[PDB]
Enzyme design. Structure first.
Site, PDB file in Angstrom:
ATOM      1  N   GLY B  10       0.653  -1.209   0.115  1.00  0.00           N
ATOM      2  CA  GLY B  10       0.032   0.089   0.051  1.00  0.00           C
ATOM      3  C   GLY B  10       0.910   1.262  -0.087  1.00  0.00           C
ATOM      4  N   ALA B  12       1.088   3.857   2.216  1.00  0.00           N
ATOM      5  CA  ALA B  12       1.857   3.910   3.601  1.00  0.00           C
ATOM      6  C   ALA B  12       3.175   3.266   3.586  1.00  0.00           C
ATOM      7  CB  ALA B  12       1.030   3.907   4.675  1.00  0.00           C
ATOM      8  N   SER B 140      -0.298  -0.267   6.098  1.00  0.00           N
ATOM      9  CA  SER B 140      -1.499   0.507   7.060  1.00  0.00           C
ATOM     10  C   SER B 140      -2.750  -0.077   7.394  1.00  0.00           C
ATOM     11  CB  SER B 140      -1.927   1.788   6.267  1.00  0.00           C
ATOM     12  OG  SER B 140      -2.463   1.549   5.126  1.00  0.00           O
ATOM     13  N   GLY B 143      -5.744   1.897   4.716  1.00  0.00           N
ATOM     14  CA  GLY B 143      -6.149   1.560   3.233  1.00  0.00           C
ATOM     15  C   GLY B 143      -6.759   0.243   2.935  1.00  0.00           C
ATOM     16  N   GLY B 146      -3.629  -1.920   2.117  1.00  0.00           N
ATOM     17  CA  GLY B 146      -2.676  -2.090   3.254  1.00  0.00           C
ATOM     18  C   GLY B 146      -3.330  -3.022   4.300  1.00  0.00           C
ATOM     19  N   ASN B 206      -0.739   7.341  13.980  1.00  0.00           N
ATOM     20  CA  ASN B 206      -0.404   8.597  13.154  1.00  0.00           C
ATOM     21  C   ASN B 206      -0.802   9.919  13.827  1.00  0.00           C
ATOM     22  OD1 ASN B 206       0.761   8.010  10.890  1.00  0.00           O
ATOM     23  ND2 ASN B 206      -1.078   7.951   9.710  1.00  0.00           N
ATOM     24  N   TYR B 224       3.225  13.614   5.174  1.00  0.00           N
ATOM     25  CA  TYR B 224       3.522  12.436   5.004  1.00  0.00           C
ATOM     26  C   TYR B 224       5.003  12.240   5.276  1.00  0.00           C
ATOM     27  CZ  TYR B 224      -1.311  10.455   4.464  1.00  0.00           C
ATOM     28  OH  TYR B 224      -2.510   9.989   4.614  1.00  0.00           O
ATOM     29  N   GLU B 254      16.092 -11.674  20.583  1.00  0.00           N
ATOM     30  CA  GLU B 254      16.074 -11.774  22.172  1.00  0.00           C
ATOM     31  C   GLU B 254      15.403 -10.975  22.686  1.00  0.00           C
ATOM     32  OE1 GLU B 254      20.375 -13.087  22.926  1.00  0.00           O
ATOM     33  OE2 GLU B 254      20.131 -11.653  24.540  1.00  0.00           O
TER      34      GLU B 254
HETATM   35  N1  LIG Z   1       2.404   7.582   8.263  1.00  0.00           N
HETATM   36  C1  LIG Z   1       1.999   7.398   7.318  1.00  0.00           C
HETATM   37  N2  LIG Z   1       0.573   6.874   7.369  1.00  0.00           N
HETATM   38  C2  LIG Z   1      -0.075   6.948   5.756  1.00  0.00           C
HETATM   39  C3  LIG Z   1       0.409   7.398   4.769  1.00  0.00           C
HETATM   40  N3  LIG Z   1      -0.221   7.214   3.598  1.00  0.00           N
HETATM   41  C4  LIG Z   1      -1.482   6.533   3.966  1.00  0.00           C
HETATM   42  N4  LIG Z   1      -1.416   6.250   5.581  1.00  0.00           N
HETATM   43  C5  LIG Z   1      -2.305   5.738   6.299  1.00  0.00           C
HETATM   44  O1  LIG Z   1      -3.344   4.960   5.391  1.00  0.00           O
HETATM   45  C6  LIG Z   1      -4.373   5.467   5.247  1.00  0.00           C
HETATM   46  C7  LIG Z   1      -4.867   5.693   3.786  1.00  0.00           C
HETATM   47  O2  LIG Z   1      -4.814   4.507   3.045  1.00  0.00           O
HETATM   48  P1  LIG Z   1      -3.554   4.089   2.476  1.00  0.00           P
HETATM   49  O3  LIG Z   1      -2.383   3.268   2.731  1.00  0.00           O
HETATM   50  O4  LIG Z   1      -3.183   5.295   1.665  1.00  0.00           O
HETATM   51  O5  LIG Z   1      -4.114   3.436   0.918  1.00  0.00           O
HETATM   52  P2  LIG Z   1      -3.473   1.817   0.501  1.00  0.00           P
HETATM   53  O6  LIG Z   1      -3.014   1.200   1.747  1.00  0.00           O
HETATM   54  O7  LIG Z   1      -2.621   2.016  -0.664  1.00  0.00           O
HETATM   55  O8  LIG Z   1      -5.090   1.058   0.081  1.00  0.00           O
HETATM   56  P3  LIG Z   1      -5.836   1.912  -1.096  1.00  0.00           P
HETATM   57  O9  LIG Z   1      -5.168   2.938  -1.510  1.00  0.00           O
HETATM   58  O10 LIG Z   1      -7.312   1.891  -0.619  1.00  0.00           O
HETATM   59  O11 LIG Z   1      -5.819   0.901  -2.303  1.00  0.00           O
HETATM   60  C8  LIG Z   1      -4.528   6.567   6.114  1.00  0.00           C
HETATM   61  O12 LIG Z   1      -5.549   6.975   6.973  1.00  0.00           O
HETATM   62  C9  LIG Z   1      -2.983   6.717   6.965  1.00  0.00           C
HETATM   63  O13 LIG Z   1      -3.504   6.358   8.475  1.00  0.00           O
HETATM   64  C10 LIG Z   1       1.793   7.881   4.851  1.00  0.00           C
HETATM   65  O14 LIG Z   1       2.545   8.223   3.877  1.00  0.00           O
HETATM   66  N5  LIG Z   1       2.611   8.157   6.128  1.00  0.00           N
END
Ligand SMILES: Nc1nc2c(ncn2[C@@H]2O[C@H](COP(=O)(O)OP(=O)(O)OP(=O)(O)O)[C@@H](O)[C@H]2O)c(=O)[nH]1
Ligand SMILES: Nc1nc2c(ncn2[C@@H]2O[C@H](COP(=O)(O)OP(=O)(O)OP(=O)(O)O)[C@@H](O)[C@H]2O)c(=O)[nH]1
Ligand SMILES: [Ca+2]
Ligand SMILES: [Ca+2]
Ligand SMILES: [Cl-]
Ligand SMILES: [Mg+2]
Ligand SMILES: [Mg+2]
EC number: 3.6.5.-
Lengths: 61, 440, 423
Positions: B10, B12, B140, B143, B146, B206, B224, B254
């Site tokens: 994903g 994140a 994440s 997502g 994720g 986050n 981000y 460990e």
């Molecule tokens: N710390 C951090 N969290 C992120 C970032 N991007 C997305 N997230 C987390 O992931 C959530 C959004 O989903 P994404 O991860 O962007 O989407 P994905 O995992 O690619 O899945 P889809 O886009 O729905 O296909 C947000 O609510 C954040 O909590 C990032 O760049 N940094």
């Protein structure tokens, strides 16, 4: 050590089975949710076929 | 030997993977073209850094990593970015349609179409390993990819590599930077489905990272990039024991033995210090005792919760830099007499310590200051359950009206999986209550 | 690589559609011939979403133009950017529908629809990854309303796993004098409730009230009304056309906006309306006077909301203010959907404005709009007035009753969740 191997296999066994049980059940449901939606639209075309037929019957009167 | 394969799933996961691998390269003196002048063993070796990097005959050091996303825009930036040359094209895997923040699309509908290829490419990395140790999965909770695809991958990895260890770095959702209203649904679904397949999961709130950036780096509205560069520091401290070796170095495994009393209770709370801007660091060296103190200030935790109102099951201190055992023992003695640290009655109260002498690195143009020494505390505290409760409550509010549930049923899921997952979380919250009750 | 296929049907549909393409073409740097002359590379990063690439580095809107009357097809052809469109994508009839829903949905449109699907299919066949369709049309006319809802039904048959979006203009006595417009609207909603995923309710009642009272335009013209529609449509699509994390996919937006499949009728909003500070944009954007749907949000509750801010501005200020209006208006957001208000910022300012804000709301107060149409509708059905216009095309009068009940069911459902509680 036989027991350790036995329990690692059952974990792989039940894992793959449960996974395969979900991916099949999942395909059944999405197929049936689409099938029913296309069923509906086709019933609108049948209702559309009759209505157009109901128009030519009243032109003869 | 005993190599680790990182998997970034994903947006994140991928973007945090970009921060981590950039940081790893700077810590190991690896250039963006993969060359490492200091490595005199060309094309191979059993050095400590070889747990995370393989070597080619041409002298390129290649992350033992796989990047996966169901849409290409995020990985495309890797394919064209500063470190594009670091990865062999086949390490970067992309679909064409995303999961639209729908766990079902990532797990079933869109995930099923790419899972085989991903495993095949993961298999191509394991075949290059003489003694593969396990996997590090970055993703994440929120997502669709994720959460859903990760669960699918974790399920399929437990089949193809039996009980070989799998560690998670999970991004816990926070409203400040959140993307969807359904994240409580996806968070519960993925937690339920990976729980049996994950040996240890490091949760990152986050909101916690958001607050730390605004308070400790005076960043008025973190991006981000701000959050990921901090997250990479924590990930680096945790993996530093695997990538460097030394006289006081303690392997992650460990620490892992002490942090997981029961298989289900494998969610350590991470705390990191010092997070300080270079304007404040100037003429203000942080001592061993000062950063150790910060490990017990909740404002420095990766997950918002109150250890003061819970019980400890383990406490690990991972120092890196200019640290020697004496200063550590001194600081702990002060802490033990001056802080609220109550353990469950059934486990020892000692602190497990590890030290890496390689000091922390900062990425050019970052917000953190370079410091002589840093510390990451890993603690098994019952307070981590607070994060489940907050999320479980948000799940309950929407599910009572079946809000948004139709988007999941339309992709093939059943209401049963929602209640089955919520019930598992109920047990998990009750499991955390049980571990913290006194003995009779 | 995530393409949208645009469809415009009827006069209203074809004219707001043309104006929509004028606005976004400017924002992306595309001149009436289809040549790029822009200053920023961000204009083109997601240009594919609405444009095809052609030989000679020319950009062609992925649009098809439909009407049962040729008048509007010449009008589009000779207007601004008229020659930018693909000439084969004009599917025009000869006679028209005479403001009759039945003619557009069942008879005259049925003859032309197949030729329309052919051009839809080919635009779709050349898509890397089609995400869905957006339709512009009125619900008070005959071509756009009836044939548009037919086309939606036929497209969903061939693309059932794709998103169907509509900008549907709702009729009002304050603009159109025609009398049977309440019949056509109710029949359209009956279809839209079942076969669309997102419907932006563009209300002519509200657009008039805005032009007369706020803009102080006595006797407003259709150009005055559409000026408001193009500003809204440009704002709704900003997240789709420019690189922004939030709602960048039609269904990712739908997933965040549609908590129940049938309640997908949105109140659009825009600010500022004139002819500015971040606090004033936000509370202006949440005002009843700034809504494009003649509804008072304070007479209902918000299920989900999407706010889009355009221009250079302090995001810490945008966060603070969006978070402030929720604490102060917490009674008007349902408590059983946590964090149901999302915010996007687009660095790109609009045309003629330094800062703007577009509002997309799924509020249970949208029932006020449907109740109005139900009132106009029932007043005629109780007297069976004008029904011969429809029975002559084969329809049965109990199909009206079905539409009425289904729309009255929709209103009750909006009231159903407006009265819901958590504990
Ligand atoms: N710390 C951090 N969290 C992120 C970032 N991007 C997305 N997230 C987390 O992931 C959530 C959004 O989903 P994404 O991860 O962007 O989407 P994905 O995992 O690619 O899945 P889809 O886009 O729905 O296909 C947000 O609510 C954040 O909590 C990032 O760049 N940094
Ligand atoms: N705001 C606005 N509304 C318009 C405009 N043109 C038409 N309408 C609306 O369109 C509706 C009437 O239908 P038409 O525009 O004639 O579309 P149609 O379905 O093709 O009508 P016929 O072909 O005559 O059956 C009314 O509710 C009008 O308010 C316009 O330029 N601006
Ligand atoms: Ca070597
Ligand atoms: Ca007029
Ligand atoms: Cl869909
Ligand atoms: Mg994504
Ligand atoms: Mg007309």
């Amino acid at each position: 050590i036989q027991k350790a191997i036995e329990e690692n296999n059952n974990f792989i066994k039940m894992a793959k089975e449960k996974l395969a049980q979900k991916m099949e059940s999942n395909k059944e449901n999405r197929e049936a949710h689409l099938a029913a939606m296309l069923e509906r639209l086709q019933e609108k075309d049948k209702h559309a076929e009759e209505v157009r037929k109901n128009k030519e019957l009243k032109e003869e009167a | 030997m005993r190599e680790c394969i990182s998997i970034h799933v994903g947006q994140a996961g991928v973007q945090i993977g970009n921060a981590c691998w950039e940081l790893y390269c700077l810590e190991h003196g690896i250039q963006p073209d993969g060359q490492m002048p200091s490595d005199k063993t060309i094309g191979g070796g059993d050095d400590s850094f070889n747990t995370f990097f393989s070597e080619t005959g041409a002298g390129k050091h290649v992350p033992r990593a796989v990047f996966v996303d169901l849409e290409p825009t995020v990985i495309d930036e890797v394919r064209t970015g500063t470190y594009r040359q670091l990865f062999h094209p086949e390490q970067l895997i992309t679909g064409k349609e995303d999961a639209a923040n729908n766990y079902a699309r990532g797990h079933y509908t869109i995930g099923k179409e790419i899972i085989d290829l991903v495993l095949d490419r993961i298999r191509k990395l394991a075949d290059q390993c003489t003694g593969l140790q396990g996997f590090l999965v970055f993703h994440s909770f929120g997502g669709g990819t994720g959460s859903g695809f990760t669960s699918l991958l974790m399920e399929r990895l437990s089949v193809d590599y039996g009980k070989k260890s799998k560690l998670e770095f999970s991004i816990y959702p926070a409203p400040q930077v959140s993307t969807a209203v359904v994240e409580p649904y996806n968070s519960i679904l993925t937690t339920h489905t990976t729980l049996e397949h994950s040996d240890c999961a490091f949760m990152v709130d986050n909101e916690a990272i958001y607050d730390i950036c605004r308070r400790n780096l005076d960043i008025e509205r973190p991006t981000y990039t701000n959050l990921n560069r901090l997250i990479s520091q924590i990930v680096s401290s945790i993996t530093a024991s695997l990538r460097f070796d030394g006289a006081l170095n303690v392997d992650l495994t460990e620490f892992q033995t002490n942090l997981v009393p029961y298989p289900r209770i494998h969610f350590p709370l991470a705390t990191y210090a010092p997070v300080i801007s270079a304007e404040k660091a100037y003429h203000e060296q942080l001592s061993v005792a000062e950063i150790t103190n910060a490990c017990f200030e909740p404002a420095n935790q990766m997950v918002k919760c109150d250890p003061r109102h819970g019980k400890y099951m383990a406490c690990c201190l991972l120092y890196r830099g200019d640290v020697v055992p004496k200063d550590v023992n001194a600081a702990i003695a002060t802490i033990k007499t001056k802080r609220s640290i109550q353990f469950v009655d059934w486990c020892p109260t000692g602190f497990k310590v590890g030290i890496n002498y390689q000091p922390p690195t900062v990425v050019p143009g970052g917000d953190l200051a370079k410091v002589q020494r840093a510390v990451c505390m890993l603690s098994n505290t019952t307070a981590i359950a607070e994060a489940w409760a907050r999320l479980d409550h948000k799940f309950d509010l929407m599910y009572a009206k079946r809000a948004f549930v139709h988007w999941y049923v339309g992709e093939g899921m059943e209401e049963g999986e929602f209640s089955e997952a919520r019930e598992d979380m109920a047990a998990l919250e009750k499991d955390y209550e049980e571990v913290g009750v006194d003995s009779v | 690589m995530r393409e949208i296929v645009h469809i415009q049907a009827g006069q209203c549909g074809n004219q707001i559609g043309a104006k929509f393409w004028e606005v976004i073409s400017d924002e992306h740097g595309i001149d009436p011939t289809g040549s790029y002359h822009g200053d920023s590379d961000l204009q083109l990063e997601r240009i594919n979403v609405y444009y095809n690439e052609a030989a000679g580095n020319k950009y062609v809107p992925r649009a098809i133009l439909v009407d049962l009357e040729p008048g509007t097809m010449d009008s589009v052809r000779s207007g601004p950017f008229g020659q930018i469109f693909r000439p084969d994508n004009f599917v025009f009839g000869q006679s028209g529908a005479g403001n009759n829903w039945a003619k557009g949905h069942y008879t005259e449109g049925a003859e032309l629809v197949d030729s329309v699907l052919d051009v839809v299919r080919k635009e779709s066949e050349s898509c890397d990854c089609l995400q869905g369709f957006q339709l512009t049309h009125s619900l008070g006319g005959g071509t756009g309303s009836g044939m548009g809802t037919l086309l939606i039904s036929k497209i969903r048959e061939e693309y059932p796993d794709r998103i169907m979006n509509t900008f549907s203009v709702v009729p009002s006595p304050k603009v159109s004098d025609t009398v049977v417009e309440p019949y056509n609207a109710t029949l359209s909603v009956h279809q839209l409730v079942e076969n669309t995923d997102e419907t932006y309710c563009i209300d002519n009642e509200a657009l008039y009230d805005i032009c007369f009272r706020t803009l102080k335009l006595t006797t407003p013209t259709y150009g005055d009304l559409n000026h408001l529609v193009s500003a809204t449509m440009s704002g709704v699509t900003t997240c789709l056309r420019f690189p922004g994390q939030l709602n960048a996919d039609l269904r990712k937006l739908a997933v965040n906006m549609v908590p129940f499949p049938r309640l997908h009728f949105f109140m659009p909003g825009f600010a500022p309306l004139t002819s500015l500070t971040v606090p004033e944009l936000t509370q202006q954007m949440f005002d009843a006077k700034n809504m494009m749907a003649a509804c008072d949000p304070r007479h209902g509750r918000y299920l989900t909301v999407a706010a889009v801010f355009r221009g250079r501005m302090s995001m810490k200020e945008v966060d603070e203010q969006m978070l402030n209006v929720q604490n102060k208006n917490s009674s008007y957001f349902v408590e059983w959907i946590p964090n149901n208000v999302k915010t996007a910022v687009c660095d790109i300012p609009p045309r003629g404005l330094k800062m703007s804000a577009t509002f997309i709301g799924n509020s249970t107060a949208i029932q006020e709009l449907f109740k109005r149409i139900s009132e106009q509708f029932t007043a005629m059905f109780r007297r069976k007035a004008f029904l011969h216009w429809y029975t002559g095309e084969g329809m049965d009068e109990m199909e009206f009753t079905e539409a009425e009940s289904n729309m009255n069911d929709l209103v009750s459902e909006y009231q159903q969740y407006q009265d819901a509680t958590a504990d």
